[PDB]
Amino acid sequence: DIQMTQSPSSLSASVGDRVTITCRASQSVWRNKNVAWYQQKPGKAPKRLIYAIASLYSGVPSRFSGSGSGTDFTLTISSLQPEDFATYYCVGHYGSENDAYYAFGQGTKVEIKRTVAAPSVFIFPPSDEQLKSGTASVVCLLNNFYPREAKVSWYVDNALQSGNSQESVTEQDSKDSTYSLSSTLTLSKADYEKHKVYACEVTQGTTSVTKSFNRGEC
Amino acid sequence: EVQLVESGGGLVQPGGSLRLSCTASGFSIDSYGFSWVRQAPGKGLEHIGYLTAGGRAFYASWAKSRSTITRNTNENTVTLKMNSLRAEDTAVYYCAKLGTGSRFAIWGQGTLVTVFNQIKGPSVFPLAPSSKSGGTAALGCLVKDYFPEPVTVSWNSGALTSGVHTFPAVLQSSGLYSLSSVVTVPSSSLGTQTYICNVNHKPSNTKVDKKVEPK
């Protein structure tokens, strides 16, 4: 019925930076006062920070400042702090006659920059217990690295795999600000027992790290 | 103290109807208007509808066809009811006075509505430590082929929390979920320290404990 288009969908900025999250109205309600800004921490309920475009709620640090322009509303954090890294949603109330509804934004994930770190790559063969069930999962672990962008490729007897793997990534660790990633290659017991060499290639920029095992060797 | 409480969550088979009820303690539900908002796992916030402090209820486009918000001043509650449930309706459901233009805004803690076509306990397989590891080794558990979410994973009944990564579950092409929990430990402990993952799957009342031994 209307759309609160947010921007950027995610951003990275170190402590003390000045962050600017914007939120547009798809149509034009000319002048809307009932726009708010919410904050949500991982696994937590949303928390309100700004109401009525610019009114700072009591208890909210004054670094959060709300700004208006009729249709484009802007959240501004002057000096970024450690507790300010979360997801921010803009919400606005709109209504005409037989229509009334709130509209949230896509959100903005505010992540913290840090020194690039290379992952500790580990590869795990399928357990013999699983083979009895007819399927073999091979798992590759990328532990405690930065940034999140990495290409993880699977080779079975040096043939690049495709379509048989799924990835999962954690959130930024609250301590070291690093990510951990797992890539799970799913093979049939028959296909797993036909081939010998299983490899995981992790590519970040100009570095590729491959960890492999031979089926049946310790 | 908590003043806005959601109740009536749980699991519901597809096509069934969720019946959630917001409850206020310390004030009145007639004195303010209240919204229902939901959040799918790993997704943004989505508005369902709201009920004015007067008594007229408004719904969003998707929720119009299916939803229904009523209240009862006798018990200080407002109640959401949907129908024709499906996979995308699985979410955490909050009631809240959004207060986008007024001072008073109050949220609930939320409640989980899970839409399930089946109930399957998990299979837990070991992620055996590296034999090629005096530094740090990696070990863990593979929680495969369960439904619906979620499973909780702890290590040695909670004693081991440092360096543990329990990844978000992915949906496999089979339509079953799968996740890994991993931990990095010093290599010298692999003959001394016992490592057990505790996987609980409340939907199927299954808990699996698995000892992760080298080799």
Note the main attributes of this structure.
heterodimer, A: 218 residues, mainly beta, Immunoglobulin-like, 2 domains, seven-stranded mixed β-sheet, four-stranded antiparallel β-sheet, 2 helices, elongated, B: 215 residues
In short:
Chain A has 218 residues and is mainly beta. Chain A is built from two helices and 19 strands.
Secondary structure layout plus pairing:
The complex is a heterodimer of chains A (218) and B (215).
Chain A: E1 4-7, E2 10-12, E3 19-25, E4 35-40, E5 47-51, E6 55-56, E7 64-67, E8 73-77, E9 87-95, E10 100-104, E11 108-111, E12 120-124, H1 128-131, E13 135-145, E14 151-156, E15 159-160, E16 165-169, E17 179-188, H2 189-194, E18 197-204, E19 207-214
Parallel strand pairs in A: 2-11
Antiparallel strand pairs in A: 1-3, 3-8, 4-5, 4-9, 5-6, 7-8, 9-10, 9-11, 12-13, 13-17, 14-15, 14-18, 16-17, 18-19
Chain B: E1 4-7, E2 10-12, E3 19-24, E4 34-39, E5 45-51, E6 57-59, H1 61-64, E7 68-72, E8 77-81, E9 91-97, E10 106-107, E11 111-115, E12 123-127, E13 136-146, E14 152-155, E15 164-166, E16 170-171, E17 177-186, E18 196-201, E19 206-211
Parallel strand pairs in B: 2-11
Antiparallel strand pairs in B: 1-3, 3-8, 4-5, 4-9, 5-6, 7-8, 9-10, 9-11, 12-13, 13-17, 14-18, 15-17, 16-17, 18-19
PDB class: immune system
Keywords: anti-phosphohistidine antibody post-translational modification antibody humanization, immune system
Assembly: dimeric
Tell me what the structure shows.
The PDB classes it as immune system. The entry lists the keywords anti-phosphohistidine antibody post-translational modification antibody humanization, immune system. It forms a dimeric assembly. Anti-Phosphohistidine Fab hSC44.ck.20.elbow bound to Glu H1. The complex is a heterodimer of chains A (218) and B (215). Chain A has 218 residues and is mainly beta. Chain A folds into two domains: 4-111, Immunoglobulins (Immunoglobulin-like); 120-214, Sandwich (Immunoglobulin-like), CATH 2.60.40. Chain A has helices at 128-131, 189-194, and strands at 4-7, 10-12, 19-25, 35-40, 47-51, 55-56, 64-67, 73-77, 87-95, 100-104, 108-111, 120-124, 135-145, 151-156, 159-160, 165-169, 179-188, 197-204, 207-214. In chain A, the strands form four sheets. In chain A, strands 2, 4, 5, 6, 9, 10 and 11 form a seven-stranded mixed β-sheet that branches. Chain A has a four-stranded antiparallel β-sheet with strand order 1-3-8-7, with no helix packed on it. The longest helix of chain A is centred in the C-terminal third of the chain and has 6 residues, at 189-194. Chain B has 215 residues and is mainly β. Chain B folds into two domains: 4-115, Immunoglobulin-like (Sandwich); 123-211, Immunoglobulins (Immunoglobulin-like, Sandwich). Chain B is built from one helix and 19 strands. In chain B, strands 2, 4, 5, 6, 9, 10 and 11 form a seven-stranded mixed β-sheet that branches. The radius of gyration of chain B is 22 Å and the shape is elongated. Chains A and B meet through β4, β5, β9, β10 and β12 of A and β5, β12, β13 and β17 of B.
